[PDB]
Write an enzyme that holds these catalytic residues in place. Structure first.
Site, mmCIF file in Angstrom:
data_model
loop_
_atom_site.group_PDB
_atom_site.id
_atom_site.type_symbol
_atom_site.label_atom_id
_atom_site.label_comp_id
_atom_site.label_asym_id
_atom_site.label_seq_id
_atom_site.Cartn_x
_atom_site.Cartn_y
_atom_site.Cartn_z
ATOM 1 N N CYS A 197 0.864 -1.242 0.050
ATOM 2 C CA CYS A 197 0.096 0.126 -0.004
ATOM 3 C C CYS A 197 0.838 1.246 -0.130
ATOM 4 O O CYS A 197 2.287 0.909 -0.038
ATOM 5 C CB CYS A 197 -0.941 -0.046 1.173
ATOM 6 S SG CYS A 197 -0.004 0.132 2.843
ATOM 7 N N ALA A 199 2.613 3.240 2.354
ATOM 8 C CA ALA A 199 3.723 3.080 3.050
ATOM 9 C C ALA A 199 3.971 1.891 3.393
ATOM 10 O O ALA A 199 5.033 1.455 3.879
ATOM 11 C CB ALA A 199 3.451 4.062 4.381
ATOM 12 N N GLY A 200 3.107 0.793 3.237
ATOM 13 C CA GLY A 200 3.459 -0.826 3.521
ATOM 14 C C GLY A 200 3.048 -0.860 5.058
ATOM 15 O O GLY A 200 3.674 -1.868 5.368
ATOM 16 N N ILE A 201 2.210 -0.179 5.765
ATOM 17 C CA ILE A 201 2.116 -0.512 7.148
ATOM 18 C C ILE A 201 0.597 -0.547 7.266
ATOM 19 O O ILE A 201 0.198 -1.229 8.403
ATOM 20 C CB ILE A 201 2.990 0.240 8.179
ATOM 21 C CG1 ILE A 201 2.616 1.769 7.978
ATOM 22 C CG2 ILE A 201 4.681 0.082 8.105
ATOM 23 C CD1 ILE A 201 3.178 2.785 9.099
ATOM 24 N N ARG A 203 -2.833 -0.534 5.384
ATOM 25 C CA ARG A 203 -3.644 -1.453 4.612
ATOM 26 C C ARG A 203 -2.947 -2.680 4.497
ATOM 27 O O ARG A 203 -3.468 -3.876 4.717
ATOM 28 C CB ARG A 203 -4.039 -0.861 3.087
ATOM 29 C CG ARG A 203 -5.033 0.320 3.169
ATOM 30 C CD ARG A 203 -5.406 0.589 1.900
ATOM 31 N NE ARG A 203 -5.809 1.782 1.884
ATOM 32 C CZ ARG A 203 -6.143 2.371 0.663
ATOM 33 N NH1 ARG A 203 -6.045 1.911 -0.423
ATOM 34 N NH2 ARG A 203 -6.469 3.718 0.967
ATOM 35 N N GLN A 244 -2.602 0.696 11.355
ATOM 36 C CA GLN A 244 -2.080 2.152 11.675
ATOM 37 C C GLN A 244 -3.531 2.596 12.307
ATOM 38 O O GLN A 244 -3.482 3.657 13.292
ATOM 39 C CB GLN A 244 -2.062 3.071 10.678
ATOM 40 C CG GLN A 244 -0.448 2.754 10.134
ATOM 41 C CD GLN A 244 -0.166 3.633 9.251
ATOM 42 O OE1 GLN A 244 0.916 4.137 9.355
ATOM 43 N NE2 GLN A 244 -0.845 3.742 8.165
#
EC number: 3.1.3.48
Length: 263
Positions: A197, A199-201, A203, A244
């Site tokens: 996604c 930032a990769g954190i 979703r 997140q």
């Protein structure tokens, strides 16, 4: 057992030196969201003219069999490195959870060719042989080889995630995850499933945590012990901050509860 016993706020460090190096600064989409050194994907076989060719903002996630790579959406200058990662790790399934642009902000640089086209991305050749539209996602059948080795990489590109908050129900995500699961199991000794996604954190963490819990229920059945906060903390030990928002946290329980109810 998909009941929420703890609130998100109870969910509340390891070195990230490599991500912090000056040579790597422009390979990060967000200045302070960096991979831990102990689980980062280390890229080998780089161009020997490049002093630093081993870095991508990505981490292996091993549930603690299937593993994952959690990564950011490509930047124009990391598309080549992304395909080096997929090649080297023998990944055969890529889960893209964003559009390329959401609310007029880039979230990922197109790193695949149009249908019935091929492109070379550095040393990697990628051919898009067929796309299939589904209500909630598009599947692209990609063929990847090293220009100097071909294998099929199936990209499942989720369509329907709202540009604000999370989906109000999980049916789309669960149909998509189920197709992902069966495709991965269809391919002998496939490598880790790539999930990204912006930032990769957020979703990415929500999809990976749902998949991990659903996979436990496959092995153990509907009455097995589930512990969502423990599973989140376990994935957070491998990439910072995964899952997140409170909405994503509530979505995880909703998705596993709906999965249980299909069984």
């Amino acid at each position: 057992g998909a009941h929420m016993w703890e609130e998100f706020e109870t969910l509340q460090l390891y070195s990230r030196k490599e991500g912090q190096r000056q040579e790597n600064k422009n390979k990060n989409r967000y200045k302070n969201i960096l991979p831990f050194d102990h689980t980062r994907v280390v890229l080998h076989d780089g161009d020997p003219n490049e002093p630093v060719s081993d870095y991508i903002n990505a981490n292996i996630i091993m549930p603690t069999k299937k593993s994952y790579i959690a990564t950011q959406g490509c930047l124009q200058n990391t598309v080549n490195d992304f395909w080096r990662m997929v090649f080297q790790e023998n990944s055969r399934v890529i889960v893209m959870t964003t559009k390329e642009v959401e609310r007029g902000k880039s979230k990922c640089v197109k790193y695949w060719p149009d249908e019935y086209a091929l492109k070379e991305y550095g040393v990697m050749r990628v051919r898009n042989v067929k796309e299939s539209a589904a209500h909630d996602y598009t599947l692209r059948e990609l063929k990847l080889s090293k220009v100097g080795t071909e294998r099929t990489v199936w990209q499942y590109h989720f369509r329907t995630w709202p540009d604000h908050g999370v989906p109000s129900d999980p049916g789309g995500v669960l149909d998509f995850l189920e197709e992902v699961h069966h495709k991965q199991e269809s391919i002998m000794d496939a490598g880790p499933v790539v999930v990204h996604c912006s930032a990769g954190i957020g979703r990415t963490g929500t999809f990976i945590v749902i998949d991990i819990l659903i996979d436990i229920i496959r092995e153990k059945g509907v009455d097995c012990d589930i512990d969502v906060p423990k599973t989140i903390q376990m994935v957070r030990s491998q990439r910072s901050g995964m899952v997140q928002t409170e909405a994503q946290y509530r979505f995880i329980y909703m998705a596993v509860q709906h999965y249980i109810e299909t069984l």
